[PDB]
Amino acid sequence: ERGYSFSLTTFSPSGKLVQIEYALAAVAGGAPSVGIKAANGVVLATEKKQKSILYDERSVHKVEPITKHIGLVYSGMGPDYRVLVHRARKLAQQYYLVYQEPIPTAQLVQRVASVMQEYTQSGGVRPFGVSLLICGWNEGRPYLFQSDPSGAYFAWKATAMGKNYVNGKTFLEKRYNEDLELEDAIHTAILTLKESFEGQMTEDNIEVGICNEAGFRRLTPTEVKDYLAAIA
Amino acid sequence: NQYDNDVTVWSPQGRIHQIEYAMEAVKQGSATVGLKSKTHAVLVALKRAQSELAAHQKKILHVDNHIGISIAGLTADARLLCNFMRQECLDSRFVFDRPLPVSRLVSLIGSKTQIPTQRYGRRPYGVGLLIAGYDDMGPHIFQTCPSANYFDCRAMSIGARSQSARTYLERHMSEFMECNLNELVKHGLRALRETLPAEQDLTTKNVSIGIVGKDLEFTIYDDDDVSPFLEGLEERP
Amino acid sequence: SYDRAITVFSPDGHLFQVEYAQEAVKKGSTAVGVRGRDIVVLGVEKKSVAKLQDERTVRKICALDDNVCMAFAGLTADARIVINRARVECQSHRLTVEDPVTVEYITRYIASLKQRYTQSNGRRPFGISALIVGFDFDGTPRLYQTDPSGTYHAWKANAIGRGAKSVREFLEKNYTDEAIETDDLTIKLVIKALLEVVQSGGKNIELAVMRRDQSLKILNPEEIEKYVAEIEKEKEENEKKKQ
Amino acid sequence: SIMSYNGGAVMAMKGKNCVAIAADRRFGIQAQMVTTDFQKIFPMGDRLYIGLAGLATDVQTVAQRLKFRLNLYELKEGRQIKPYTLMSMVANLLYEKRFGPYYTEPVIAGLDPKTFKPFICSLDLIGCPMVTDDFVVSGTCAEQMYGMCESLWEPNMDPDHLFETISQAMLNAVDRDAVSGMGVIVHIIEKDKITTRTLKARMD
Amino acid sequence: SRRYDSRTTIFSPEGRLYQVEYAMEAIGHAGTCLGILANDGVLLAAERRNIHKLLDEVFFSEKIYKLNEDMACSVAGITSDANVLTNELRLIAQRYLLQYQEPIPCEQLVTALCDIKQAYTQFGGKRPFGVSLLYIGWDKHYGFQLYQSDPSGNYGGWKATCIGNNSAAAVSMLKQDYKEGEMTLKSALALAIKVLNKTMLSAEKVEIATLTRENGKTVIRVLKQKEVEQLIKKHEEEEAKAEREK
Amino acid sequence: TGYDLSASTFSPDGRVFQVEYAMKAVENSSTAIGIRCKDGVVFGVEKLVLSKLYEEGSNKRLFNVDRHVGMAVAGLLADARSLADIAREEASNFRSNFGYNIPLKHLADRVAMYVHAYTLYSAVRPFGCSFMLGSYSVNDGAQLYMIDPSGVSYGYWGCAIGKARQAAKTEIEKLQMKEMTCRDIVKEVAKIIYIVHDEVKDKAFELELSWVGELTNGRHEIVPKDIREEAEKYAKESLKE
Amino acid sequence: SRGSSAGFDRHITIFSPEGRLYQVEYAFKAINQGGLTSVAVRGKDCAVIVTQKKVPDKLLDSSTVTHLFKITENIGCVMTGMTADSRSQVQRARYEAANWKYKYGYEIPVDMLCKRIADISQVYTQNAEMRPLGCCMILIGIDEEQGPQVYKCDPAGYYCGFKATAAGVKQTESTSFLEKKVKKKFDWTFEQTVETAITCLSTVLSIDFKPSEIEVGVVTVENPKFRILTEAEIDAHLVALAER
Amino acid sequence: EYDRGVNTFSPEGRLFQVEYAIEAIKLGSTAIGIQTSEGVCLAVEKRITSPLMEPSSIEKIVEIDAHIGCAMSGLIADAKTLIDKARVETQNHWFTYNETMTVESVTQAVSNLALQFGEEDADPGAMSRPFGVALLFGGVDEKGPQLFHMDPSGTFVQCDARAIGSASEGAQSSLQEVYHKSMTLKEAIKSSLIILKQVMEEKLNATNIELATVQPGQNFHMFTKEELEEVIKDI
């Protein structure tokens, strides 16, 4: 077969693209994720609860590096996220090949959001069922972006996604402060996750990445263990 | 119903309704009979006139010196298939400098007409064919169907009311092999006449004949050229 | 690509998509054409005159070449597409034949484009009807009409769009050899035909004229108002004659 | 030989907190002069210029396509391009025609949009970039320009001294080349201003 | 497959294109954008909908996009569709500049984009773009210009217009407040502030861009928070005096 | 209920009903049986004769797909001929690329994957035929495979497809085919075909016999006429008593 | 809502009002149609896959009825669900691994092969014209750095590494049993891992296996090549299990 | 409706779209062709819809070639592609073989397009539906005068006299009542005009009908208003 040529996302009489709203419902049912932009870096945190202890929790990561200076996390459907991660890495490399410079975070976000938009209008496909938090560092500045299934993107100082993200956003509003440093941001992000977390959090229950001048990196379970011991 | 609009939809009974509807297309057409002896293959086609002032639609076509066909069903599909068959015979003569054997032509027709029965948006060919041919294995009568199945027949009849012709052919087939050409054509004409209603009768206007044989290239007889074959025909019961 | 059959026959032998395109045409503002002896006049109902709109940008009368112009009724964007295609074709005809197009030639081209869009996969019909007026190189004035189905005819005078039935009935009662003896009377016939339908006055009317050997000339609102005043004078004087 | 068809010469030079870019003005076809005001240096930013020598048609085409790409880049990114990024963009453009190459060898000269640091570079016709700290040259009289620059260039020149150095280099180099000259144009790019001058030059 | 096909580009029994009407319904709920043409410039004023306290500002503006040296636009409707269309607009402008080595006249850019939109309404079986655009620009043929386009591919030039939420009330206000041929940039900004106040203001909730000519060059500028705050305060005291006088 | 119209749609129970419907088409066909013995493979088919007008041998359901590989079919005959053409192309292409006779298991896998490709899409419908492939080689022995409309391929010692597959399987299970020759197996195949044939419903039928084994030197061919006459005599004698 | 539906969301892979993909869930249900169950257990220096073997007809050639496949000399897999879907997926995995070695010059890691197959599956879940495959793949192999590796991919495009896992009808009970076993301890020897896998299968089915009712495949750090056990070895394991 | 593809057979063995297109033919203006030994005469009611319309712009009889004319009925806009194909066919035949195409061959080439419509496995330029027009090809070749009828189904037949369009029933009955094989071209022209006058609604006059003839001597000839007036006067 060849793919269907007609769009599966169309306007409703009320003016809504209901498939986009349904993909957003899928996103809202995902595992909670949090991003905080500090003065000197960005922290991405996400709940990483496995169904059972049989799962090798250290085999699949939710916090992924796109480039030395760009990482991302998601809420929603994992396989869709893998697709978008692969596309984002390809786009960043293409930018680097043309301009011989690491792609700016905003440019990467715009290109990925363009792909996501394409999946709301092309024939015979559904939208991606994920929302992305993209963190980056360039021009001596940290960047935190969110990109939605519709292909719309926003710049955030702090935000929460996934299950219970409205309470998370209220909590971040109360706690967030532009002047706080990166370690305080990590503490605040873990606290935000704790609000909507079921059971005890361990270094194997959550995943954390940080972006700063040195670059983006996923934190190790030992570092997360130290931060959790401090949080208690 | 929900199973009877596309060729790619199996019904819960294991049938494909669109193919059966194309079969109906064939069953609507005017009767045609094919039969053979040890040396000859004969097609006799009853031609219809849409109006008393219109010519009767041609039912027998040339394909190659050794192959002719009689059509029943949609005539445009018949022309498509006839053009394909003609091209196949031309390709055989061009490449191998020999006439295409009749059975291989029928196999090619089968593949060609089976392809659309499995693809979305396509339809079956709405024509049945009687194929009269002569090759190294002697004379041949083949019947091809919209279902893309084909049959090798001692004799056959297709089209409206062709069951009567088939009854006659079943009754008399024992005599066909040892028939001379004239007796063979007369048997074909009697079989075809069995399809006619009481009011209608075989004439030189609504009958066409096609003959192929060892020393006889496929020849189509129409109008007064049919009178010699009709002359010896008795009166129907 | 997308290859659905959009325009298909219905049981009664009707192409519903073509009929619905003609409904869309009937929703458009009325356009009127009159074929004079030395002048062809096009008028269009400038419906819902918004004081803030830049009228130059929403003109429903346009030029296809130096000797052919067009008015339309229906979907404006489809009309823009068709007009651009026709302009390209007019230039191609100049290039290959080394002469200007006849009005009939480009009319045939547009009608063929429309018919093609009623019989090709993955496309809906154009929702516009067109009045094409012009002068052939030998000087004959020409007025043609095309509709979404791709059929076209020549007319002495015609109307399209909403209220085209009443306007056509008025033109039947008013198109005479006397009524087109002069350019003024041809223009006034077009203005009267539009006034039979337009909401009020000449404010809601855009008028263009093509004279032999000259290019498309748009009548400015002052000229239209003067013509409307003359028409009102004639109406009052003739009604006084009747009384 | 294809790049000698029209002649021409461009040169760029680095000062202390300034750059200079210069070009000859002749547009000719082989031995015949056609005009004496042909543009070979094109602005690409407030403080960023590209000079193009070689075949005149390719000079114009490359300048125009580069402006296309740069305009789109600056709209999409919302910022002025840095000199190194422009060099990479030009290299990509030229290499795209690796087997059908444009016959021009650009030089770039500018200041960093945020730091105002001097930058110069040169590219071969298929886009190999070469960043240097003193000077680059391109065109038919490259050897003459190399001699003049190797002899006259000094580090940390102020704008007036840079002007005199690049001017003397260009004038004396083109005076020994038949198909380059008919005037010289010089742009001095500083933090606060761009000074454009045309020199008194031999017109034979 | 025929069963699942939405049939986006077909007429309805009354001669309507339902997907286009629904897209216009979508635009009706988007953020308000208004354009006003004056003798010495043209302005766009857009209501910001991204007003959450934790949002960061990193860009030139939220809803106003520069299209080329002489042209900018505002978009109401689906944001990602708008990004697609703004990229296409920039590409069209640059293609024109490459071919002719002059900036594209504003109406030509608008027509080129509306052709794409109209194409999406006539064939291909795709949903149309759910975007309406206001364009402001300057060219040498017609000077300062303001255009509007909608998902159907229709477009028109305006002296003042509004798209998005409460566009009808804003249009009524402009009809009763715009002085044809007698508008300056200053009075245009005052009128924009008044109209946005009615169809809704505070500085952080609106972005305003002006387009003017200075020394034969086009200047496109987004007013900073200081200028917008001053305009809002000027409108507030003007309204206070008007109320007191009565 | 709407779930059974396309092969690209799972029912809520995880079934693909279009494939099951194609299998029903197979089930409404006259039976064919293949039997693997020590020396080779024997195929028998109960070709129903739908009218005396047809020449003997019309609508054959045994095909040569390669010198060493025979194929017996049940279901939609046109689909079966299409699959036979596919199998022939696969064997010829394999010989062209690798320079030797395609192993039967590999050919069966390739054709089964071709069949499977038609079970995934709304663009096409599943094949309406099941078929057996038989081969014998010195290096590989005797091999018998069966493929069904879903694309499932399995090797067998005895296989029956068609409307009387279960009764034919019950009869086949009574033979110790692993220690028999093709010469006795042809008689047993004829007997089974005659047993399972429904004399009332099915009217008349021709017995089609083919085999491939040591006695044919690895070439698949129709059973010689005298052998078939002996086998049919034995089958009729077994029926009458 | 709960189990709500709009438009065609039950027939093609478009989101339901809840954000679900019903066709993917139906493919998961199709996995159980085969009626079989497989288990995989990761030891200290070995990985083992056990699976039910069913041959209801004595006319079937039992050698040809298997669910264990070599993907590469060092990578083996057990497939669960619709057989033809499984065979197509095995063909695709073999192609991916051979292409990987051809393009990069070293053998594909198990995790990367599982990711590639899962990406193909994900594509099936976003394009409406084809259905997802109704099968689940469990891969085992020895990675030179990580040691033994057990990975699973499913029709949703979701994959993961596991200490132990199961697929098929008795997946949930198998996972409960294995969860208890790994909780008590995880550092198993080769014999211990094989016996744990066999006991999981036997307990969930409640059968005591004859050698011919199950299939076993193993990779070990000593012999990383994927090996399918013979009825002799299986019977040795079964007797060593019964005696204890 | 879209519940079916354009290539769907009905339970009676007919393509739905072709039957609907034939229904469309039954809405066209009436045309009548008569074949005699001295030539072929085609006639067609113009069906003027408004006195403001120009009757000369209604082209229902067109020249395919000097020796072939075509009358049409139904959706006339659809006929343009078929007419152009016929014209290009005759000119290709002349270019290749240096001879004139027979009427039957031209009719066959046109009829080969009737069923060339479909949606899937169709490249752009493919027709989405059948042509809704019926054609009467009249001509003169080596076999004398020839009249052929083609309908949307691709079936074409030679006819002595045929009526197509809305009133084709009564017209055909009258043609059967009046036609004999020995009639002269003048007789055929008079009879066709009488039948048209009978089945038409507007009064038959020289402006609201079209009449052409093909003869072995003269080429395809369209009657002028004065010739039409002369023929009509004797009715």
Residue numbers in the entry:
A (entry chain B): 3 to 234
B (entry chain F): 4 to 240
C (entry chain D): 2 to 244
D (entry chain J): 2 to 205
E (entry chain C): 2 to 201, 206 to 251
F (entry chain G): 6 to 246
G (entry chain A): 2 to 245
H (entry chain E): 7 to 241
What does the paper say about this structure?
To experimentally determine the selective mechanism against the human proteasome, we solved a cryo-EM structure of human c-20S in complex with TDI-8304 (c-20S-TDI-8304). The cryo-EM map was refined to an average resolution of 2.0 Å. In the β5 pocket, TDI-8304 binds in an antiparallel binding mode, which is consistent with the computationally docked model. However, the steric hindrance from Pro126 of c-20S β6 forces the P5 pyrrolidinone group of TDI-8304 to flip downwards and toward the cyclic ring, resulting in a loss of two hydrogen bonds from pyrrolidinone compared with TDI-8304 in the β5 of the Pf20S wild type.
The proteasome of the malaria parasite Plasmodium falciparum (Pf20S) is an advantageous drug target because its inhibition kills P. falciparum in multiple stages of its life cycle and synergizes with artemisinins. The 20S proteasome core particle is composed of two antechambers located between an α-ring and a β-ring and a catalytic chamber centrally located between two β-rings. Unfolded peptide substrates must pass through the antechamber before reaching the catalytic chamber for degradation. We recently developed a macrocyclic peptide, TDI-8304, that is highly selective for Pf20S over human proteasomes and is potent in vitro and in vivo against P. falciparum.
